[PDB]
Amino acid sequence: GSMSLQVNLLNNTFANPFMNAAGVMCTTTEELVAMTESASGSLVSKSCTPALREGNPTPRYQALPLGSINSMGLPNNGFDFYLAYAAEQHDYGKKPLFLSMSGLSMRENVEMCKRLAAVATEKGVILELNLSQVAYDFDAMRQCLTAVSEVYPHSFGVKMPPYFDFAHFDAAAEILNEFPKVQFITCINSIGNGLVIDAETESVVIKPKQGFGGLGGRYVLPTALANINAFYRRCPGKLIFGCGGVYTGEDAFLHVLAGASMVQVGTALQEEGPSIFERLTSELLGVMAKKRYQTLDEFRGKVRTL
Amino acid sequence: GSMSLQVNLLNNTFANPFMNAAGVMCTTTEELVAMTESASGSLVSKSCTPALREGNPTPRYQALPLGSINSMGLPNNGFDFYLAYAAEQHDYGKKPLFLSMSGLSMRENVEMCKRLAAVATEKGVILELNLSQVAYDFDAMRQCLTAVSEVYPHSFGVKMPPYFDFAHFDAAAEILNEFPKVQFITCINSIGNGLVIDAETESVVIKPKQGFGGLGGRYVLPTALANINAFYRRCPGKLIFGCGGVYTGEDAFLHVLAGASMVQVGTALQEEGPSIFERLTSELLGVMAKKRYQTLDEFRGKVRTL
Ligand SMILES: Cc1cc2nc3c(=O)[nH]c(=O)nc-3n(C[C@H](O)[C@H](O)[C@H](O)COP(=O)(O)O)c2cc1C
Ligand SMILES: Cc1cc2nc3c(=O)[nH]c(=O)nc-3n(C[C@H](O)[C@H](O)[C@H](O)COP(=O)(O)O)c2cc1C
Ligand SMILES: Nc1c(C(=O)O)[nH]c(=O)[nH]c1=O
Ligand SMILES: Nc1c(C(=O)O)[nH]c(=O)[nH]c1=O
Q1: Any idea which positions bind fumarate (chains A, B) (predicted)?
Q2: How far, in Å, are B19, B52, B67, B249 from residue B217 at the CA level?
């Protein structure tokens, strides 16, 4: 009978594991408010750079039968804006808040983190540092985490690009394991630089980068699951946030089974809007009721191998 | 008007660009014969090691709604077998033959190539060197190609794992461009180490490697197109063979638009059997008819960017 999607991590309680994926429906005040008013357990603001960015020329996003492709190019209101939202506007009474940071250089991250620190202390906003590029360069990654850890006296998480072999899972996990402050790992950012071609128009579907763009949605689910689980296994001291290919409570069930604590929703949210969180909570509860699970902790990470 | 799927490359004529992906339906004599008797323009033998390999424990392949996952583990009849097939049995009158080679070390590839050379000379079998792991380690990749190029007195092709960013496309192309004997690049091998989880059983679906395995099929098409196109652009001296996500003539059309000369079919072929090539040729012809193309040359690599 009695079930709960409650998640507890980083001294916070989340009503449920769902949140937007960074960059989806979280750029403007209006979006952040809608995410906060939504049934989501949490939200994360658009990955920010120190100054506003208009991002790439349009079209830079295309929804697809099997997901999405994008090359948004970090359009965002700038760090000050997301800092102010976290410091002054966000209703922490409603749900915890993650702030995604994507400085274009290590120095930019360091300088933003210096300023984020006080707000994290005061309001409890949690950094998701977008490493996804940095995450495909392990030396740079360690360097970056060192620099940020030096100036940011709080736990935070990293948003990772997907990896595709155990050597990379091992190497990434080894670096992340060097940093106790990295308390969560978000797997995954989009599968990088896919190329969608529309057979009718015989063209690509997005303008930037000759049509090459990050894949999200149903394309990425097994890759997301792999990475969630790969890091779940290799970083037992950390939590994993799942991101990639979640359209239904069943998809979310798979993320959690693979090891996810929070489950982020990108493409599906972009296509459906924040009402999706009511559906997803209801669907995950339904999947759990059918499977006789009462809590997420009961099956998180418990995917059975053969 | 008159249409033709004919492809001319590597001093050969192909009735059409279709062939099996290495490792699919090309391990046994019967499979090779069936591929030869099929409507495909060519075939490639299962990636071989010097000796017979039993491969990984089963289940090691699973068909999925969006494609497939596998960790076959190079089950193959051994090099002598594929070499003998190429030397003694294959009917080159029907179609050219590619031999896929995947030695477990540089040494093995060298020794097999040394022996393959004569059969390539006499019979015209074309090596597809499986680099896909080696191709994710650019030094190992350089070393592998240097070694093979040193001992193997023929043009050959390389089967590439997918890359996911331009830095990698550039790095790989730079390396490939340093080897004039590499005259085709097959993009792509499976998307590595996805993890399929069956929500019903709460388990992975293949046994080896904790359920992690290469993704093929619908999952991989934009990644395949990206890679085909990325290397099509960066290796203008070379042919690109497309592989990944081809189930229909329209998919094939996308491959060719992206730059593919040959189009390899794995997952779809696994599920449908070699009769698929009759459907694929018909479908591709139909797509070309509706679009008023008469030859593949007319649109190969002509994907329009915005
Ligand atoms: C339009 C769009 C914008 C995105 N912006 C960001 C971003 O700013 N920062 C980030 O880390 N990921 C960003 N992502 C990637 C998502 O956070 C997520 O990692 C990816 O889309 C996979 O999730 P999905 O399959 O639910 O779409 C974006 C994705 C999309 C489609
Ligand atoms: C069962 C199976 C066996 C495969 N064996 C090989 C192989 O031996 N050598 C190789 O280069 N690729 C192998 N592959 C990868 C395919 O050749 C192809 O690169 C990949 O499956 C993507 O094509 P697809 O989407 O049509 O399946 C195999 C794939 C599958 C599913
Ligand atoms: N910053 C990101 C973007 C973007 O284009 O802004 N798109 C993504 O898919 N992932 C990111 O991390
Ligand atoms: N050798 C390969 C296999 C295999 O399992 O043998 N599976 C793949 O997906 N790709 C390969 O190159």
Answers
A1: 46, 73-74, 130, 189
A2: 15, 27, 4, 14
